[PDB]
Amino acid sequence: TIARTIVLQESIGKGRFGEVWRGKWRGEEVAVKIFSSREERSWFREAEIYQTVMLRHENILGFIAADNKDNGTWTQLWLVSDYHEHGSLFDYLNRYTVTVEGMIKLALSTASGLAHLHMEIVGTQGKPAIAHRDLKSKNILVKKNGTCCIADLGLAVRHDSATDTIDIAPNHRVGTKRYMAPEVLDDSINMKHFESFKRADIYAMGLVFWEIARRCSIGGIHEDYQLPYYDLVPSDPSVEEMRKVVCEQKLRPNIPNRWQSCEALRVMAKIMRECWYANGAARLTALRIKKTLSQLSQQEG
Numbered sequence: 001t002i003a004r005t006i007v008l009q010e011s012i013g014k015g016r017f018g019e020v021w022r023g024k025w026r027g028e029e030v031a032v033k034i035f036s037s038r039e040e041r042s043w044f045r046e047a048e049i050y051q052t053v054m055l056r057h058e059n060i061l062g063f064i065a066a067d068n069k070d071n072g073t074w075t076q077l078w079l080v081s082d083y084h085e086h087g088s089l090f091d092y093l094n095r096y097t098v099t100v101e102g103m104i105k106l107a108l109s110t111a112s113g114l115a116h117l118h119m120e121i122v123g124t125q126g127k128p129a130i131a132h133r134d135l136k137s138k139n140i141l142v143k144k145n146g147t148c149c150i151a152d153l154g155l156a157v158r159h160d161s162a163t164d165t166i167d168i169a170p171n172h173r174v175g176t177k178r179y180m181a182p183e184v185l186d187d188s189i190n191m192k193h194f195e196s197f198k199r200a201d202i203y204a205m206g207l208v209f210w211e212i213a214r215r216c217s218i219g220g221i222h223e224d225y226q227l228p229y230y231d232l233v234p235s236d237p238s239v240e241e242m243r244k245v246v247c248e249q250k251l252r253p254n255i256p257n258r259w260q261s262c263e264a265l266r267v268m269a270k271i272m273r274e275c276w277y278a279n280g281a282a283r284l285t286a287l288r289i290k291k292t293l294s295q296l297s298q299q300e301g
């Protein structure tokens, strides 16, 4: 009933694990991720994540439905969600410079979304803790109200606190190399301990916060948009190239010293550093980050 009544209007998507389209359903705009029939396991798994869990949160992409929109010629697997005109945080930071307020809004909402993911809720109608495993600016969408919501949950892992096991994901491809955490790059991560996954998400979130801050325009001064490590790796960096920069040279994105001439940028800078430790146990928790960002939020207004 759902997919059959949706009319596709334009391609507003990427191309790595399926394709996105802007659509029209009963007069409203909606986003649709179409997977081919062969790409069926990534489709189910992503649908499984958005569904099997109590993942309703304003900072997580509003999932609408999964529909085996079957064609007698070639089926076609649809994933439907809320549509966001602004597009990715990545697109956003490339087009606009942000205010101190706009920056806190972006960073805080991203942190709450991950915090909501990472947060377990044991019991009757609970919610298992979940790790993203592919957080980056292109997987975060900015809403019309200046806030963000996390997207692309196709590679997430869910934690079964009961048996302490991890509900692995069915697919043939890990995450984005550029954002891979230190442990992941040198392949020293204990992929059997859930906490490790959450720790990897924080590091990546730290890189995203850098991307936002860099675009915070104050007194007309700001840097142009850049992806983390733009000054150290080529485009589409290989694992080997990222490991040498991050693990052997122990390098992280550069932090302008000017970011201390502002209370907010000072806090952000502090958070970034604390997400970039090579020792995952030392990194901040998403919840913690939300709290300090929340406090800094109340002070600014």
Ligand SMILES: Cc1cccc(-c2nn3c(c2-c2ccc(F)cc2)CCC3)n1
Residues within 6 Å of the ligand: 012, 013, 014, 020, 031, 032, 033, 050, 061, 063, 079, 080, 081, 082, 083, 084, 085, 087, 088, 138, 139, 140, 141, 151, 152
């Ligand atoms: C679950 C689901 C359903 C439909 C699309 C998507 C979806 N997955 N991804 C993006 C969107 C997206 C969402 C809204 C929009 F306006 C444009 C793109 C961007 C990067 C990965 N995810």
